[PDB]
Amino acid sequence: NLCPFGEVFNATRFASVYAWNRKRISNCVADYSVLYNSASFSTFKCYGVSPTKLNDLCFTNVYADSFVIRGDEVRQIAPGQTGKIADYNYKLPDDFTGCVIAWNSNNLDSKVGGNYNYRYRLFRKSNLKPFERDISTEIYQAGSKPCNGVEGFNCYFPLQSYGFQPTNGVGYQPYRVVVLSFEATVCG
């Protein structure tokens, strides 16, 4: 039986990067040839194992963390990387065993008039620990006086929605990013 990469990569809808969707993949054969030879994934490189060499090596648990980010911070999805998404939204550990697939999705996610469904965490007290999923939308306090969850000065809602437009440039287009992580029932 085949591993269900078709329900991840060819899915109808993704999730935003603060609530990044994680699905555990196990007890199946993972055919990676349809991923590498698809010729549609623009950004693809692999850490800890060569991508043409991981086809005949077997892991135990595979997590396919998937989200939608702007095309500039695809470089932020990397081990040992500092930035905005890599600190407040989705941090990869330094010992990251697995790899990242990012392809352009202007033709689906960037609708006419602006797409504001996708938000990213912008204000946070501390940087994220690796593989942390933060769902809380409490009104962030940046100053001394707490302001009890109402909007105002030094009271910022931490999720700023992306402005995704077909008019936007290549760096501002939405890129559906799928991140694979590896650790013995996921063979090739």
Epitope: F123, S144, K145, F153
Partner: antibody, heavy 121, light 107 residues
Amino acid sequence: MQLVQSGPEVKKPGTSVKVSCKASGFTFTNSAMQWVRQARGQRLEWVGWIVVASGNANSARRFHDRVTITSDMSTSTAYLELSSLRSEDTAVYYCALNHCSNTTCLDGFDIWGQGTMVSVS
Amino acid sequence: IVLTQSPVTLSLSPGERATLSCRASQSVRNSLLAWYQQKPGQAPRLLIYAASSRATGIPDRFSGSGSGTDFTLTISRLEPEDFVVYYCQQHGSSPPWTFGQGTKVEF
């Protein structure tokens, strides 16, 4: 720790102004700039404020429909353009910033600009 | 929400004790009534933040006291360069972080 502002612009009652305010010595964190318009011989006023990291501008009620107060984190700047530039707009425009001490931010607009003699001639 | 300040000129001698007060017309939320001074025609600068705290880099002789609506700016030692227009703030509310009329510290 200095906000270098643009120079004066002598304008006309049909035109629009474009006042910039660059932040020197540091980069924009979640710093919440405000903008203060001073007609000479009058009190200070309030134009609007930008959360610079978010870009959520919010202008005052008499300025509700004809000033857009934009910011750019890439250049570490924050702009202002006021529409229709009436004869009761000859003033000095002050970009006031709240200092953020990383771990947190302050509650006071301490570092200011230097002024912009927006002249309506 | 509008902020009214108190006496429009402090016409009294240098080198003594003066009190400055901002009588708000609506109650200031979270006590955010920072105090600025502005010598006429030049850039203002901050003295009191969060309605009581002394600012960083600013020396002594100023004091913000009280919270809510009753409010005091306490200047201790009027040097000749403290004869300046002094301003409130209400950047606490939402919109119209309304200033004051100012006053005139006068000899």
